[PDB]
Amino acid sequence: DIVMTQTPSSLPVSLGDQASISCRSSQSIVHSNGNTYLEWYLQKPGQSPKLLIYKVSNRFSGVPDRFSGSGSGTDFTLKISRVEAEDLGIYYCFQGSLVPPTFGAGTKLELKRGGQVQLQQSGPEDVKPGASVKISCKASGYSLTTAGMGVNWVKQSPGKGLEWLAHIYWDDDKRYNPSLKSRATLTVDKSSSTVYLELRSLTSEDSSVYYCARRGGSSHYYAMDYWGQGTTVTVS
């Protein structure tokens, strides 16, 4: 099992400053075919994460020239040349090359003090311990069955960071994270283009925000280029 290590935990900066974040893997992240799948995501304070960099070197569309991938092998570094007010948030590094894809611990960029594809998620669910939940993600602006498309489910707990939960593929290949102890079930409604995640036995540990994200094409190297706004699940 693979562990991403994000070196700076904090790294406060001032506007217009060089910024560098590092990520290091417990094993070589590379794939049987010619490829390291490593991504950099930005999460601004009140919002879902968003894709910055994929295939370790590549800027996703809309991402300004400030950002650069600059990694190889077991060691990768994201760099911002000139920091702007927009660039403030928590940065996560992500490996997609192995079976339980793992996120980095995060790095929070904060100011120094002084001197049309869309994914829609169902509403919040409050439930009692032992109960079950079914949350939905409705994709529009594209087709779930298009080659290369997939849907990842990722969970964010307070303080526990980002954790990968499950995946469904355009051929309806469904894979889960053994951490869930087979309590998860993915299903699909093709005509409504809606993917359903079901959690079977709930404890307070399962209380988190649940995001669904689209693994992009083979063009984006299966980086998650579009995210839902999240669904808050709360266990009494």
Write out the DSSP string of 198-236.
Answer: EE-S--GGG-EEEEEEEE--TTTTT-EEEE---EEEEE-
Which tokens belong to 215? Answer: 């693994």
The single residue listed with the structure tokens 């192995």 is 98
**Dihedral sign computed on CA atoms, order 221, 94, 64, 211:** positive
List all residues 6 or more positions away from 218 whose beta carbon is below 8 Å from its beta carbon.
Answer: 147, 148
Give the determination technique: X-ray
φ, ψ at 180 (rounded to 5°): -80, -10
Query: Dihedrals φ, ψ of 165, to 5°?
Result: -110, -60
In this structure, what is the dihedral angle of CA atoms 169, 53, 230, 234, given to the nearest 10 degrees? Answer: 100
Q: Is 6 exposed, middle or buried (0-12, 13-18, 19+ CB in 10 A)?
A: buried
Q: What are phi and psi of 148, to 5 degrees?
A: 100, -20
Distance CA 1, CA 34 (A): 21
What secondary structure letter does DSSP report for 72? B
Q: Report the b/e string of 76-114 with b at 16+ CB within 10 A.
A: bbbebeebeeebbbbbbbbbbbbeebbbbbbbebeeeee
Rg (CA), the chain: 18
DSSP 124: P
Collect all residues with Cβ–Cβ distance below 8 Å to 176 and sequence separation of at least 6.
Answer: 165, 166, 167, 182, 184, 186
Tell me how far apart the alpha carbons of residues 44 and 18 are, in angstroms, rounded to a whole number: 19
- Resolution of this model in Å is 3.3
Q: How far, in Å, are 44, 151, 168, 169, 197 from residue 174 at the CA level?
A: 30, 10, 5, 7, 11
What is the DSSP code (8-state) at residue 179?
A: G
Judging by beta carbons within 10 Å of its beta carbon (0-12, 13-18, 19+), is residue 153 exposed, middle or buried?
buried
- Could you give the CA distance from residue 140 to residue 194 in angstroms, rounded to a whole number? 9
